[PDB]
Design a protein around this motif. Structure first.
Motif, PDB file in Angstrom:
ATOM      1  N   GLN A 117       0.842  -1.199   0.000  1.00 48.87           N
ATOM      2  CA  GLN A 117       0.000   0.000   0.000  1.00 48.87           C
ATOM      3  C   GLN A 117       0.886   1.261   0.000  1.00 48.87           C
ATOM      4  O   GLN A 117       1.543   1.562   0.993  1.00 48.87           O
ATOM      5  CB  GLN A 117      -0.949  -0.049   1.215  1.00 48.87           C
ATOM      6  CG  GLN A 117      -2.154  -1.004   1.137  1.00 48.87           C
ATOM      7  CD  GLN A 117      -1.775  -2.479   1.028  1.00 48.87           C
ATOM      8  OE1 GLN A 117      -2.167  -3.177   0.101  1.00 48.87           O
ATOM      9  NE2 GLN A 117      -0.980  -3.019   1.927  1.00 48.87           N
ATOM     10  N   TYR A 118       0.922   1.983  -1.124  1.00 48.31           N
ATOM     11  CA  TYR A 118       1.853   3.077  -1.449  1.00 48.31           C
ATOM     12  C   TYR A 118       1.162   4.453  -1.331  1.00 48.31           C
ATOM     13  O   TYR A 118       0.029   4.626  -1.793  1.00 48.31           O
ATOM     14  CB  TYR A 118       2.424   2.914  -2.876  1.00 48.31           C
ATOM     15  CG  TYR A 118       2.728   1.511  -3.395  1.00 48.31           C
ATOM     16  CD1 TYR A 118       1.691   0.606  -3.704  1.00 48.31           C
ATOM     17  CD2 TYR A 118       4.066   1.124  -3.610  1.00 48.31           C
ATOM     18  CE1 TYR A 118       1.992  -0.696  -4.147  1.00 48.31           C
ATOM     19  CE2 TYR A 118       4.371  -0.153  -4.120  1.00 48.31           C
ATOM     20  CZ  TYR A 118       3.330  -1.074  -4.377  1.00 48.31           C
ATOM     21  OH  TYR A 118       3.607  -2.313  -4.861  1.00 48.31           O
ATOM     22  N   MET A 119       1.833   5.433  -0.715  1.00 47.10           N
ATOM     23  CA  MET A 119       1.336   6.794  -0.459  1.00 47.10           C
ATOM     24  C   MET A 119       2.392   7.826  -0.850  1.00 47.10           C
ATOM     25  O   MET A 119       3.550   7.655  -0.484  1.00 47.10           O
ATOM     26  CB  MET A 119       0.998   6.948   1.035  1.00 47.10           C
ATOM     27  CG  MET A 119      -0.030   8.052   1.311  1.00 47.10           C
ATOM     28  SD  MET A 119      -1.611   7.961   0.414  1.00 47.10           S
ATOM     29  CE  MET A 119      -2.183   6.301   0.874  1.00 47.10           C
ATOM     30  N   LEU A 120       2.016   8.904  -1.544  1.00 45.61           N
ATOM     31  CA  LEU A 120       2.949   9.876  -2.122  1.00 45.61           C
ATOM     32  C   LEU A 120       2.945  11.145  -1.266  1.00 45.61           C
ATOM     33  O   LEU A 120       1.927  11.822  -1.107  1.00 45.61           O
ATOM     34  CB  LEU A 120       2.572  10.143  -3.598  1.00 45.61           C
ATOM     35  CG  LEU A 120       3.615  10.881  -4.470  1.00 45.61           C
ATOM     36  CD1 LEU A 120       3.999  12.276  -3.978  1.00 45.61           C
ATOM     37  CD2 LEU A 120       4.889  10.066  -4.642  1.00 45.61           C
ATOM     38  N   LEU A 121       4.112  11.423  -0.692  1.00 43.96           N
ATOM     39  CA  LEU A 121       4.407  12.481   0.260  1.00 43.96           C
ATOM     40  C   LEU A 121       5.385  13.455  -0.435  1.00 43.96           C
ATOM     41  O   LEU A 121       6.246  13.058  -1.237  1.00 43.96           O
ATOM     42  CB  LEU A 121       4.915  11.913   1.591  1.00 43.96           C
ATOM     43  CG  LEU A 121       4.479  10.483   1.975  1.00 43.96           C
ATOM     44  CD1 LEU A 121       5.052  10.175   3.344  1.00 43.96           C
ATOM     45  CD2 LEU A 121       2.967  10.286   2.132  1.00 43.96           C
ATOM     46  N   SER A 122       5.124  14.749  -0.280  1.00 42.15           N
ATOM     47  CA  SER A 122       4.899  15.576  -1.469  1.00 42.15           C
ATOM     48  C   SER A 122       6.140  15.950  -2.278  1.00 42.15           C
ATOM     49  O   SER A 122       7.161  16.401  -1.753  1.00 42.15           O
ATOM     50  CB  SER A 122       4.159  16.865  -1.120  1.00 42.15           C
ATOM     51  OG  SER A 122       4.743  17.546  -0.015  1.00 42.15           O
ATOM     52  N   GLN A 123       5.971  15.822  -3.597  1.00 36.49           N
ATOM     53  CA  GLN A 123       6.763  16.464  -4.647  1.00 36.49           C
ATOM     54  C   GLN A 123       7.287  17.863  -4.268  1.00 36.49           C
ATOM     55  O   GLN A 123       6.539  18.768  -3.887  1.00 36.49           O
ATOM     56  CB  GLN A 123       5.938  16.446  -5.948  1.00 36.49           C
ATOM     57  CG  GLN A 123       6.413  17.344  -7.104  1.00 36.49           C
ATOM     58  CD  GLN A 123       7.916  17.381  -7.359  1.00 36.49           C
ATOM     59  OE1 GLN A 123       8.647  16.423  -7.175  1.00 36.49           O
ATOM     60  NE2 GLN A 123       8.450  18.523  -7.731  1.00 36.49           N
ATOM     61  N   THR A 124       8.601  18.004  -4.402  1.00 36.67           N
ATOM     62  CA  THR A 124       9.461  19.134  -4.023  1.00 36.67           C
ATOM     63  C   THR A 124      10.732  19.085  -4.901  1.00 36.67           C
ATOM     64  O   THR A 124      10.716  18.456  -5.962  1.00 36.67           O
ATOM     65  CB  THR A 124       9.753  19.028  -2.509  1.00 36.67           C
ATOM     66  OG1 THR A 124      10.526  20.117  -2.048  1.00 36.67           O
ATOM     67  CG2 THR A 124      10.458  17.724  -2.126  1.00 36.67           C
ATOM     68  N   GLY A 125      11.845  19.711  -4.513  1.00 35.67           N
ATOM     69  CA  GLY A 125      13.171  19.322  -5.016  1.00 35.67           C
ATOM     70  C   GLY A 125      14.226  20.434  -5.093  1.00 35.67           C
ATOM     71  O   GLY A 125      13.935  21.592  -4.775  1.00 35.67           O
ATOM     72  N   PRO A 126      15.463  20.103  -5.522  1.00 38.42           N
ATOM     73  CA  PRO A 126      16.624  21.006  -5.592  1.00 38.42           C
ATOM     74  C   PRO A 126      16.570  22.082  -6.707  1.00 38.42           C
ATOM     75  O   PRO A 126      17.619  22.521  -7.186  1.00 38.42           O
ATOM     76  CB  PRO A 126      17.840  20.073  -5.764  1.00 38.42           C
ATOM     77  CG  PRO A 126      17.340  18.681  -5.378  1.00 38.42           C
ATOM     78  CD  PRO A 126      15.906  18.760  -5.869  1.00 38.42           C
ATOM     79  N   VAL A 127      15.378  22.461  -7.190  1.00 39.23           N
ATOM     80  CA  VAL A 127      15.083  23.420  -8.291  1.00 39.23           C
ATOM     81  C   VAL A 127      15.470  22.925  -9.700  1.00 39.23           C
ATOM     82  O   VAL A 127      14.790  23.248 -10.674  1.00 39.23           O
ATOM     83  CB  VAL A 127      15.656  24.832  -8.003  1.00 39.23           C
ATOM     84  CG1 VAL A 127      15.240  25.877  -9.050  1.00 39.23           C
ATOM     85  CG2 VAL A 127      15.185  25.366  -6.640  1.00 39.23           C
ATOM     86  N   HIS A 128      16.495  22.076  -9.817  1.00 40.08           N
ATOM     87  CA  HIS A 128      17.003  21.498 -11.071  1.00 40.08           C
ATOM     88  C   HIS A 128      16.683  19.994 -11.205  1.00 40.08           C
ATOM     89  O   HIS A 128      16.982  19.373 -12.227  1.00 40.08           O
ATOM     90  CB  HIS A 128      18.509  21.789 -11.187  1.00 40.08           C
ATOM     91  CG  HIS A 128      19.378  20.995 -10.240  1.00 40.08           C
ATOM     92  ND1 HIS A 128      19.602  21.255  -8.905  1.00 40.08           N
ATOM     93  CD2 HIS A 128      20.112  19.883 -10.560  1.00 40.08           C
ATOM     94  CE1 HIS A 128      20.445  20.323  -8.432  1.00 40.08           C
ATOM     95  NE2 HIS A 128      20.785  19.457  -9.405  1.00 40.08           N
ATOM     96  N   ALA A 129      16.028  19.426 -10.187  1.00 37.10           N
ATOM     97  CA  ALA A 129      15.416  18.105 -10.180  1.00 37.10           C
ATOM     98  C   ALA A 129      14.102  18.160  -9.372  1.00 37.10           C
ATOM     99  O   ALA A 129      14.073  18.749  -8.289  1.00 37.10           O
ATOM    100  CB  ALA A 129      16.395  17.093  -9.566  1.00 37.10           C
ATOM    101  N   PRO A 130      13.000  17.568  -9.849  1.00 36.66           N
ATOM    102  CA  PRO A 130      11.907  17.135  -8.984  1.00 36.66           C
ATOM    103  C   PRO A 130      12.365  16.050  -7.999  1.00 36.66           C
ATOM    104  O   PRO A 130      13.318  15.317  -8.276  1.00 36.66           O
ATOM    105  CB  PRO A 130      10.839  16.597  -9.945  1.00 36.66           C
ATOM    106  CG  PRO A 130      11.180  17.222 -11.297  1.00 36.66           C
ATOM    107  CD  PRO A 130      12.701  17.322 -11.244  1.00 36.66           C
ATOM    108  N   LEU A 131      11.699  15.942  -6.849  1.00 31.19           N
ATOM    109  CA  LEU A 131      11.870  14.869  -5.870  1.00 31.19           C
ATOM    110  C   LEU A 131      10.552  14.554  -5.161  1.00 31.19           C
ATOM    111  O   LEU A 131       9.932  15.425  -4.556  1.00 31.19           O
ATOM    112  CB  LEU A 131      13.005  15.279  -4.908  1.00 31.19           C
ATOM    113  CG  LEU A 131      13.503  14.239  -3.886  1.00 31.19           C
ATOM    114  CD1 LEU A 131      12.493  13.935  -2.781  1.00 31.19           C
ATOM    115  CD2 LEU A 131      13.904  12.917  -4.543  1.00 31.19           C
ATOM    116  N   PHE A 132      10.183  13.277  -5.183  1.00 24.21           N
ATOM    117  CA  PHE A 132       8.972  12.690  -4.620  1.00 24.21           C
ATOM    118  C   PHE A 132       9.358  11.641  -3.578  1.00 24.21           C
ATOM    119  O   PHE A 132      10.361  10.944  -3.775  1.00 24.21           O
ATOM    120  CB  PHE A 132       8.178  11.982  -5.729  1.00 24.21           C
ATOM    121  CG  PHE A 132       7.817  12.758  -6.985  1.00 24.21           C
ATOM    122  CD1 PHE A 132       8.816  13.151  -7.893  1.00 24.21           C
ATOM    123  CD2 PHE A 132       6.467  12.995  -7.305  1.00 24.21           C
ATOM    124  CE1 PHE A 132       8.475  13.826  -9.073  1.00 24.21           C
ATOM    125  CE2 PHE A 132       6.121  13.632  -8.509  1.00 24.21           C
ATOM    126  CZ  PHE A 132       7.128  14.064  -9.390  1.00 24.21           C
TER     127      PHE A 132
END
Length: 73
Positions: free
Chosen positions: A21-36
């Motif tokens: 059971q998978y849950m996505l805690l939020s998309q952010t990142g180093p401005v030059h990469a997304p990170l989820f």
């Protein structure tokens, strides 16, 4: 089953536990990469893995979830 989910890892855990059971805690990142980050739940507890895409985040989570559960770390 496979290969239609991030092959080696997802197939590994799909076989081992066909019920995570998978849950996505939020998309952010180093401005030059997304990170989820995904938290994946394997037995009563959720295991958290980070990827530059949600599909790699859940792979990381689920890979460790079963790996940790079978062997540690």
């Amino acid at each position: 089953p496979g290969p239609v989910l991030p092959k080696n890892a997802l197939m590994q855990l799909n076989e081992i536990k066909p019920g995570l059971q998978y849950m996505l805690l939020s998309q952010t990142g180093p401005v030059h990469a997304p990170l989820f980050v995904m938290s994946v739940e394997v037995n009563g507890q959720v295991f958290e893995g980070s990827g530059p895409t949600k599909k790699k985040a859940k792979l990381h989570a689920a890979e460790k979830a079963l790996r940790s559960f079978v062997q540690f770390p």
